[PDB]
């Protein structure tokens, strides 16, 4: 039903496993408290996803060198591409909140990294676009993504601590995932 | 006077320039407001740097797979290595606050990336240690670094907005720099 969304039906096993994930979670100070707070945040954000997506792609569309990654060769945004990616991003927000971070989760994170990278970019949607998303922007996007998310987390009326715990859990989870997605970009053996 | 600190005397021009930097600053939503707030934060943090360093290396030392990157071949921390890096980290905190982010700043960021990477790791201090810091941990460290910094920013008694503006400026600046440092790790042409 969501075109191109292949969580749990990926073709490849990730080159990282649950032991790697344990060690990476430690590097981002993610614990069981964060698991609980990310799940709570899912409940807060669930009815807000359309507006989150409009704000997020508003930012991407606000800078030509960012919108660039969704463009057709003629430099104009590929509207099919954008709309199809948007649907999978909506799922990713929910998955971050509700999935057990197990090997199927890791296999999908590897797949998402491959889809930003030249390895698989443009294949899922069968579009003609830019071959690769420069890595420098994947890392950079940790910031604006967390900044876009923060105001939404307030709105179900929660204590300041709860809201900071949810935002911080999202900052950890975002950093964790972007780190995983780096794999196909990194010189073999340097990751 | 600070061994190995070669800001402004680097051997190589960075493969990125001030136009790249403009585009990356936009990707992390860094503006002139952030320049002002990062400078303000420098004034707040200046007398606190020793304690920041003790807290930061407390975290690194708290996980064997992280402390690993400062170890001698026998698996024990190289104390010379740690102490020498600590001095340059102290400078980096101040430089983030006070340097114009120009080509000399970029050339040093390239150098810092090279020093985490196998390209130059262990050369500055002439130590025998792990050849490479896996990239996955450079990205991950954005989180704990910002989390370690946050409580220090409170303590000169500033408004909540001011403190959040300073923390957010530091989160942007950290993300920006780690993105730059990724260069030698990334497959040529994918950055
Ligand atoms: C914090 C960083 C980022 C997050 C959280 C994120 C999130 C996502 C998600 C969830 C998807 C869909 C994955 C799937 O197919 O199921 C996706 C795809 C995509 N993203 Fe990102 N992304 C990030 C960085 C970037 C950057 C820097 C760009 C550059 C504008 C970008 C542009 C795209 C594009 C063009 C696709 C489609 C890739 C393809 O052809 O399959 N993303 N992103
Ligand atoms: C947010 C991420 C990070 C920040 C802000 C940071 C900061 C720094 C700074 C400022 C230096 C000294 C640069 C110079 O020589 O002037 C340095 C060196 C070093 N860092 Fe990091 N670092 C980060 C990620 C990491 C990670 C993930 C590790 C793994 C423990 C690590 C371990 C080291 C080591 C071993 C050196 C010495 C490298 C060499 O041999 O020259 N750093 N770091
Ligand atoms: C990516 N959105
Ligand atoms: C790196 N400390």
Residue numbers in the entry:
A (entry chain C), B (entry chain C): 5 to 195
Give sentences copied directly from the paper behind this entry.
The other two mutations considered, Leu(142)G4Ala, localized at the proximal site just on top of His(120)F8, and Ile(149)G11Phe, adjacent to Trp(60)B9 in tunnel 1, do not produce any significant deviation in the overall conformation of the distal site and in the cyanide binding mode relative to the MaPgb*(III)-cyanide structure. off for cyanide dissociation from cyanide-bound MaPgb*(III) and Leu(142)G4Ala and from the Ile(149)G11Phe ferric mutants, all characterized by ligand stabilization through two H-bonds (to Trp(60)B9 and Tyr(61)B10), are lower than those reported for ligand dissociation from the Tyr(61)B10Ala and Trp(60)B9Ala MaPgb*(III)-cyanide species, characterized by ligand stabilization through one H-bond.
Protoglobin (Pgb) is a recently discovered haem-protein with distinct structural and functional features that make it unique within the globin superfamily. The MaPgb* structure can be considered as an expanded version of the 3/3 helical sandwich typical of “classical” globins (i.e. Mb), with an additional N-terminal extension, built by a 20-residue loop, followed by the Z-helix, which precedes the globin-fold conserved A-helix. Residues belonging to the Z-helix contribute to formation of the Pgb homodimer, which is centered on the intermolecular four-helix bundle built by the G- and H-helices of the two subunits. Thus, in Pgb the access of diatomic ligands, such as O2, CO, and NO, to the haem is granted by two orthogonal apolar tunnels that reach the haem distal region from entry sites at the B/G and B/E helix interfaces.
